[PDB]
Design an enzyme around this catalytic site. Structure first.
Site, PDB file in Angstrom:
ATOM      1  N   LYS B 158       0.821  -1.208   0.000  1.00 25.74           N
ATOM      2  CA  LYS B 158       0.000   0.000   0.000  1.00 25.74           C
ATOM      3  C   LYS B 158       0.857   1.261   0.000  1.00 25.74           C
ATOM      4  O   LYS B 158       0.703   2.122  -0.869  1.00 25.74           O
ATOM      5  CB  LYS B 158      -0.959  -0.002   1.195  1.00 25.74           C
ATOM      6  CG  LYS B 158      -1.752  -1.284   1.354  1.00 25.74           C
ATOM      7  CD  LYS B 158      -2.704  -1.205   2.537  1.00 25.74           C
ATOM      8  CE  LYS B 158      -1.949  -1.016   3.837  1.00 25.74           C
ATOM      9  NZ  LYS B 158      -0.834  -1.991   3.958  1.00 25.74           N
ATOM     10  N   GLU B 184       2.704   5.874  10.825  1.00 26.54           N
ATOM     11  CA  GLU B 184       3.768   5.545   9.886  1.00 26.54           C
ATOM     12  C   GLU B 184       4.989   5.012  10.625  1.00 26.54           C
ATOM     13  O   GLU B 184       5.460   5.627  11.588  1.00 26.54           O
ATOM     14  CB  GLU B 184       4.141   6.773   9.053  1.00 26.54           C
ATOM     15  CG  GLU B 184       5.447   6.682   8.270  1.00 26.54           C
ATOM     16  CD  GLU B 184       5.521   5.495   7.320  1.00 26.54           C
ATOM     17  OE1 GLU B 184       6.622   5.236   6.803  1.00 26.54           O
ATOM     18  OE2 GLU B 184       4.498   4.830   7.065  1.00 26.54           O
ATOM     19  N   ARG B 185       5.493   3.867  10.172  1.00 27.35           N
ATOM     20  CA  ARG B 185       6.668   3.261  10.781  1.00 27.35           C
ATOM     21  C   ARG B 185       7.915   4.082  10.478  1.00 27.35           C
ATOM     22  O   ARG B 185       8.026   4.710   9.422  1.00 27.35           O
ATOM     23  CB  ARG B 185       6.844   1.830  10.276  1.00 27.35           C
ATOM     24  CG  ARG B 185       5.700   0.903  10.648  1.00 27.35           C
ATOM     25  CD  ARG B 185       5.861  -0.462  10.003  1.00 27.35           C
ATOM     26  NE  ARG B 185       4.683  -1.300  10.192  1.00 27.35           N
ATOM     27  CZ  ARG B 185       3.577  -1.210   9.468  1.00 27.35           C
ATOM     28  NH1 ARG B 185       3.459  -0.327   8.490  1.00 27.35           N
ATOM     29  NH2 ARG B 185       2.561  -2.028   9.731  1.00 27.35           N
TER      30      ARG B 185
HETATM   31  N1  LIG Z   1       4.988  -2.645  -6.779  1.00 29.13           N
HETATM   32  C1  LIG Z   1       6.037  -3.022  -6.008  1.00 29.13           C
HETATM   33  N2  LIG Z   1       7.285  -3.105  -6.517  1.00 29.13           N
HETATM   34  C2  LIG Z   1       8.333  -3.481  -5.760  1.00 29.13           C
HETATM   35  N3  LIG Z   1       8.243  -3.798  -4.457  1.00 29.13           N
HETATM   36  C3  LIG Z   1       7.051  -3.759  -3.819  1.00 29.13           C
HETATM   37  C4  LIG Z   1       5.855  -3.356  -4.576  1.00 29.13           C
HETATM   38  N4  LIG Z   1       4.821  -3.404  -3.718  1.00 29.13           N
HETATM   39  C5  LIG Z   1       5.311  -3.799  -2.515  1.00 29.13           C
HETATM   40  N5  LIG Z   1       6.639  -4.008  -2.574  1.00 29.13           N
HETATM   41  C6  LIG Z   1       7.486  -4.444  -1.439  1.00 29.13           C
HETATM   42  O1  LIG Z   1       6.637  -4.973  -0.420  1.00 29.13           O
HETATM   43  C7  LIG Z   1       6.840  -4.310   0.829  1.00 29.13           C
HETATM   44  C8  LIG Z   1       5.498  -3.845   1.378  1.00 29.13           C
HETATM   45  O2  LIG Z   1       5.707  -2.758   2.275  1.00 29.13           O
HETATM   46  P1  LIG Z   1       4.512  -1.745   2.648  1.00 29.13           P
HETATM   47  O3  LIG Z   1       3.739  -1.416   1.393  1.00 29.13           O
HETATM   48  O4  LIG Z   1       5.115  -0.613   3.443  1.00 29.13           O
HETATM   49  O5  LIG Z   1       3.563  -2.587   3.640  1.00 29.13           O
HETATM   50  P2  LIG Z   1       2.135  -3.167   3.165  1.00 29.13           P
HETATM   51  O6  LIG Z   1       2.445  -4.058   1.988  1.00 29.13           O
HETATM   52  O7  LIG Z   1       1.628  -3.905   4.381  1.00 29.13           O
HETATM   53  O8  LIG Z   1       1.340  -1.932   2.816  1.00 29.13           O
HETATM   54  C9  LIG Z   1       7.771  -3.134   0.584  1.00 29.13           C
HETATM   55  O9  LIG Z   1       8.915  -3.227   1.439  1.00 29.13           O
HETATM   56  C10 LIG Z   1       8.197  -3.230  -0.867  1.00 29.13           C
HETATM   57  O10 LIG Z   1       9.615  -3.406  -0.949  1.00 29.13           O
HETATM   58 MG   LIG Z   2       2.148   0.400   4.990  1.00 30.37          MG
END
Ligand SMILES: Nc1ncnc2c1ncn2[C@@H]1O[C@H](COP(=O)(O)OP(=O)(O)O)[C@@H](O)[C@H]1O
Ligand SMILES: [Mg+2]
Ligand SMILES: Nc1ncnc2c1ncn2[C@@H]1O[C@H](COP(=O)(O)OP(=O)(O)O)[C@@H](O)[C@H]1O
Ligand SMILES: [Mg+2]
Lengths: 187, 355, 338, 84, 167, 118, 119, 84
Positions: B158, B184-185
């Site tokens: 997200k 936010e972390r």
């Molecule tokens: N479209 C993308 N391309 C590359 N890496 C991704 C993508 N979407 C998610 N990730 C990876 O997955 C992880 C998800 O982190 P985050 O989005 O902060 O938490 P959540 O998935 O719970 O929202 C990230 O560290 C990122 O490196």
């Molecule tokens: Mg997140």
């Protein structure tokens, strides 16, 4: 130990004041000061409303205290401290109650036990005197104390008396006696 | 005028009780700044306790709280810096920049809480937003000025989707953007700022186009609960005075309502509305209603909704489901197959998806 | 003797005039403001559920009347009201304007326009909470009104004056059928006969300005906004506004009902009305009851839904039609409020 | 201490639910306003303040890292409770 | 009712109206269930370590105007009502350093292993704020846990907060 | 018996859940704010000292044999759930097997012990 | 008989608190009439809070109620008119005929909370 | 006025209660006359100890021709009867 047990915040200050006066052996001075303050409260009906106001601010409560203290120039060396403690604790709406329990403490120790000889009709004064002497000579809470019985004309009593004295009432009223035969009659 | 000051009487965790003088009692939702050795702490009133006492929530770490300390009122809510200078700088709920790059000499300073736009100002949005992502540009187009919802669980992507949205919008549109980091972390925050620096949207030596309103979960619950409205204030200041389309990005609306229920738990706030927060409806509507396409500009609110194991029974995800108009759910199963964007083509509906 | 007189004279000052020139009968001082609640001592002449001004812009109602403080629900944000502020009672129970002026206009729980097109010229003012019509001045619901939607028109027909409930889950289209009835009333509301006319009124208790705005927009697109009165107590508005808005609409509908005209009240999302009144009661030291709801939410709902009724021909044959909805969760209407 | 000294440390927060229960007991005894599942108010704030300490420092700070491994015990696999 | 009763409760139960210098000292009004209530300690800080007369340490969580709420670092047997209490003048800390390795310590840092005393390079505050947003680096060094599944599909890196949630 | 006598003590504590039940009993009238599902707030701590006073020391051993009455057969109840973590060997007597005919009723899955090692 | 009267102290929604004098406190399940501009309102007692105050429940809406309003004590439970004159007439909880057919010309008023028979 | 009787709460107990219906206090409510009791026993009486108690061995004839017979009640058991 205070002469009698007091409960609630309306009465904790009274027993604290009595304990403080016991240290200084000035219970009479504190008592007289409290009577003077409540007489001043009765003198000005608005002042009584001022005391009972819970929204009245700290400076305003202090000003009320200086008003009631400047007259008589000092009520007592400790009761003014109790008044300012009440001000900082916001307890000016109960001063009449605190005076009430302090007075109850006073008659608790000064040998002025009070009684309620309640009757349907006002008590005949010749019969009033007979009640006083018998209870004074009796051992009902008797350790060298006086008595202050007062007639309490109530409609709940059908007739007779309920001699009340120190958590002791006699079921001598004729109303309770005629009823007590009724349930057994309806057996 | 003499500064309005008082004395602290109680501090129960994040809740601090302060006593003021006569006619010195401030209003609710104000700022009670107390000079602390560890920087500067300010408290926000929640309810009056009587006897010239106010119940407040700490906006910053409650270390070192002593009863009797001199707490001075600011005359209202703690004003946050608002203006073009705020772009490219992380701003907290207390207005004190945590980037050690100098104070934000903003054009003005607006309080966090403001009256929402009137009923007449409310209007619908029917303009396509270019987000640079094929699937969401075609199947679930974004609305310029509408309220977008980025559903998804954990490990679904997200926050990275949000930052990609900011980057693509900044590249393809000159309008400024704001990203409030509610819940936010800190590691995720460093990742976000490094990505912003490396993508060119944030230019330290020049002009930026996104301002972070990071929440920094380790601050007391009040900061987490009010960073969302701080970022919303930034967004409305950008919309009204500048008269440009802006991009409001809520980090996690679920964390916002969780923090609202949390700060309700600290205070009395007997939960009646939904079960965990009685006020939730009030402040929730106050927040959402403030994002509105007014006559000055349009604010597009892209909020991310986190559903824990599809907890749709709880009213919190349903409340967010009521606010938005176009959803961009990011189901994890799609990302597990290889399509890491993870947006479900059939579950990501759009209100403005019509001929 | 001189000193008592001097102290009596000087006691008038240094007391912020809380007792002098105020008497604490029509005025008072707020002890503390809470979550839409302001506890104020005084108001010895206050009336039950009577309006009161806080000398700041926000209104209030003394729903609770404790001896030590008058529990007043804030009619707006609690920010602008502060502890120690001087309050002034309005001298009248909570009342809202009533008349044909509200047609083609928006109002709120206090009966004021929100869009600000102009001042409201309602011909009269009735109390927000009035007694329901008596047992005698009423007749059996017999005039039929078409709903538009076949699923309700041909199966569960709503009559003129019947308090039929269109109850559903969170997402069931209750507002859809309500708007269907509103737009179906256009056929007769554009005519001349008042008997077939039905001036519908819709409540927006606790509904955010976005949803209410979209509903008003789609109502305007059908040209049915003229004969519909729209009242709104939004989510951003305080819980007391949400609690009053259905009573405001009850008074609005009763104005038409007692004037010989036919009106339709649709009590949209009364579930959040129930939760708002529960919040007000729990915040007002009221004893909690079933599901933490106070035992008088049934009292409130009975009083509100008995306003909508079919009167006899003596009162002009005017009828008020009630169509509330209950936004239950999971289809469990076995709960206390449903 | 290891993180700020340039060393790498790994911390495992075993049975964080026990810490939550202890804080709940402390708050309830202190008459603090209880919250969801009778848990104390500042419990999420407690967990955030405890967990966000562990991280990877920048190069200018010694490039230290503190790895957090929190452990909680669910009640019947219910991850929807407050602490989970 | 000409004189209504509106009082509820007050933490002051003994009217003294004198005595002072209780800013750093205090008396326990109520103590039980591992917590204590002490009147005084005017210049005490939030959750500051406080020393009792019996030797049991305490923490000042609740700071209501009537009294300061103290939670006891042990059983409540040794502490009684009215006992003198004194401020330690500092927050709770814990010995830290490289000598902690190879030792088992109590929550307060006391070595409970029984293999001698504890040698620490210094003392650090127990309640230390999290590192700032700027002084952070992306998690790139892996943590090799050893189990194939966790290492492969849910890897853990240095500085990463990974929750092991389970029944 | 374990320390002074130096003998292996076969402690058979019967219905140890009654200790926590009585703790909640006294807690309601002690002024304590009730914990989750109405239990005493200090359940964890007091049962912690009670159970940790049972341990195998150098002087001897106490082989405590405790039976826990789970309310409503709900293993998520705080007292049995925490007793699960505060105990080495677990023997769950599920009702679903008790009425199935195998009245020993030892559920073969949640009944776990630390001795299950190769 | 003495003119028993009270003063309103609290209005807990439907619940109304009235302060009486010494020995003037009525029992519970006892009607307490208050003169109101919209007719006649009575309240039955259910709880005795104390300090010469009795908690009551209203039989109708408490609109326009003010602290210090005089409360008249009937003397017993809520007496309602009884007899053949009540047949075919709409009579409310209090006892006032709400059929708009005039007052009920009943010669007796038996209290609602009569003593139940014995086993 | 609330007079105290001077004794713990008691109830008439004896062979005269046979054939008589009484209330909680033991007063005759069936209207058949006064209750003749050998003595008065406290309503709250401590249960007998381990040694005074004896193993249930004497049967109670339920007379149900059902599971009440195959699994009996016996003299002294507190056999529950649950159900709607
Ligand atoms: N479209 C993308 N391309 C590359 N890496 C991704 C993508 N979407 C998610 N990730 C990876 O997955 C992880 C998800 O982190 P985050 O989005 O902060 O938490 P959540 O998935 O719970 O929202 C990230 O560290 C990122 O490196
Ligand atoms: Mg997140
Ligand atoms: N009869 C219907 N025909 C088509 N769509 C409908 C119908 N009823 C509801 N909907 C859909 O439901 C949505 C609105 O739901 P809404 O009426 O707000 O539910 P509720 O009344 O439960 O709040 C609209 O987007 C609309 O597409
Ligand atoms: Mg709807």
């Amino acid at each position: 130990p205070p002469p009698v047990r007091l409960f609630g915040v309306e009465g904790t200050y009274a027993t604290a004041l009595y304990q403080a006066a016991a240290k200084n052996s000035s219970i009479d001075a504190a008592f007289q000061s409290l009577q003077k303050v409540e007489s001043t409260v009765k003198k000005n009906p608005k002042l009584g409303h001022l005391l009972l106001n819970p929204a009245l601010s700290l400076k305003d409560r202090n000003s009320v205290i200086d008003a009631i203290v400047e007259t008589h120039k000092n009520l007592d060396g400790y009761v003014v401290n109790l008044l300012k403690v009440l001000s900082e604790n916001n307890r000016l709406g109960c001063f009449e109650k605190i005076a009430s329990d302090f007075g109850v403490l006073n008659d608790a120790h000064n040998g002025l036990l009070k009684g309620t000889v309640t009757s349907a009709e006002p008590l005949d004064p010749k019969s009033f005197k007979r009640i006083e002497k018998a209870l004074s000579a009796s051992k009902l809470v008797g350790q060298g104390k006086s008595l202050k019985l007062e007639n309490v004309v109530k409609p709940e009593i059908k007739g007779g008396l309920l001699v009340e004295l120190g958590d002791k009432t006699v079921d001598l009223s004729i109303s309770t006696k005629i009823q007590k035969l009724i349930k057994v009659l309806e057996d | 005028s003499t500064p309005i000051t008082g004395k602290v009487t109680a501090v129960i965790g994040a809740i601090v009780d302060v006593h003021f003088e006569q006619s010195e009692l401030p209003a609710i939702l104000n700022a009670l700044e107390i000079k602390t050795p560890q920087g500067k702490l300010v408290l926000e009133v929640a309810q009056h306790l009587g006897e010239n006492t106010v119940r407040t929530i700490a906006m910053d770490g409650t270390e070192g709280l002593v009863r009797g300390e001199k707490v001075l009122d600011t005359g209202g809510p703690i004003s946050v810096p608002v203006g073009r200078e705020t772009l490219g700088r992380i701003i907290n709920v207390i207005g004190e920049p945590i980037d050690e790059r100098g104070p934000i000499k903003s054009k003005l300073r607006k309080p966090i809480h403001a009256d929402p736009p009137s009923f007449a100002e409310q209007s619908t949005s029917a303009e396509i937003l270019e987000t640079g992502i094929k699937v969401v540009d075609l199947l679930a187009p974004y609305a310029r000025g509408g309220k977008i919802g980025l559903f998804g669980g954990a490990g679904v992507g997200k926050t990275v989707f949000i930052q990609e949205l900011i980057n693509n919008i900044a590249k393809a549109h000159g309008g400024f953007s704001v990203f409030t980091g509610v819940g936010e972390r800190t590691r995720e925050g460093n990742d976000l700022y490094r990505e912003m620096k490396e993508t060119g949207v944030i230019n330290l030596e020049g002009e930026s186009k996104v301002a972070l309103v990071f929440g920094q979960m380790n601050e007391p619950p009040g900061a987490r609960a009010r960073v969302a409205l701080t970022g919303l204030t930034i967004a409305e200041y950008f919309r009204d005075e500048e008269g440009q389309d802006v991009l409001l990005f809520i980090d996690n609306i679920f964390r916002f309502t969780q923090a609202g229920s949390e700060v309700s738990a600290l205070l009395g706030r007997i939960p009646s509305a939904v079960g965990y927060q009685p006020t939730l409806a009030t402040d929730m509507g106050l927040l959402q209603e403030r994002i509105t396409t007014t006559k000055k500009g349009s604010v597009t609110s892209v909020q991310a909704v986190y559903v824990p194991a599809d907890d749709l029974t709880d009213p919190a995800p349903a409340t967010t489901f009521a606010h938005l108009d176009a959803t961009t759910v990011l189901s994890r199963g799609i990302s597990e197959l290889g399509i890491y964007p993870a947006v479900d083509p059939l579950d990501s509906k759009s209100r403005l998806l019509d001929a | 003797k001189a000193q008592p007189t001097e102290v009596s004279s000087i006691l008038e000052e240094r007391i912020k005039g809380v007792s002098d020139e105020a008497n604490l009968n029509e005025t008072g001082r707020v002890l503390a403001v809470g979550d839409g609640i302001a506890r104020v001592f005084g108001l010895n002449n206050i009336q039950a559920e009577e309006l009161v001004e806080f000398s700041s812009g926000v209104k209030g109602m003394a729903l609770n009347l404790e001896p030590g403080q008058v529990g007043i629900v804030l009619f707006g944000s609690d920010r602008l009201v502060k502890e120690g502020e001087l309050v002034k009672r309005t001298g009248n129970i909570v009342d809202v304007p009533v008349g044909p002026g509200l047609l083609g206009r928006v109002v709120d729980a206090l009966g004021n326009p929100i869009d600000g097109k102009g001042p409201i010229d309602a011909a009269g003012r009735s109390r927000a909470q009035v007694k329901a019509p008596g047992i005698l001045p009423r007749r059996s619901v017999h005039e039929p009104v078409q709903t538009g939607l076949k699923a309700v028109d041909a199966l569960v027909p709503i009559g003129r004056g019947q308090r039929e409930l269109i109850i559903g889950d969170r997402q069931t289209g209750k507002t859809a059928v309500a708007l269907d009835t509103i737009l179906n009333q256009k056929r007769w509301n554009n005519g001349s006969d008042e008997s077939k006319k039905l001036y519908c009124v819709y409540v927006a208790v606790g509904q955010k300005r976005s949803t209410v705005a979209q509903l008003v927009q789609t109502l305007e697109q059908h040209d049915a906004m003229k004969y519909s009165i729209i009242v709104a107590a939004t989510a951003s508005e305080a819980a007391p506004l949400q609690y009053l808005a259905p009573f405001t609409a009850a008074s609005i509908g009763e104005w038409f009902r007692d004037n010989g005209k036919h009106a339709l009240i649709v009590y949209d999302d009364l579930s959040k009305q129930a939760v708002a009144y529960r919040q007000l009661s729990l915040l007002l030291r009221r004893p909690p009851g079933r599901e933490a709801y106070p035992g008088d939410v049934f009292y409130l709902h009975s009083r509100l839904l008995e306003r909508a009724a079919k009167l006899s021909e003596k009162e002009g044959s005017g009828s008020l039609t009630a169509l509330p909805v209950i936004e239950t969760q999971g289809g469990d209407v076995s709960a206390y409020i449903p």
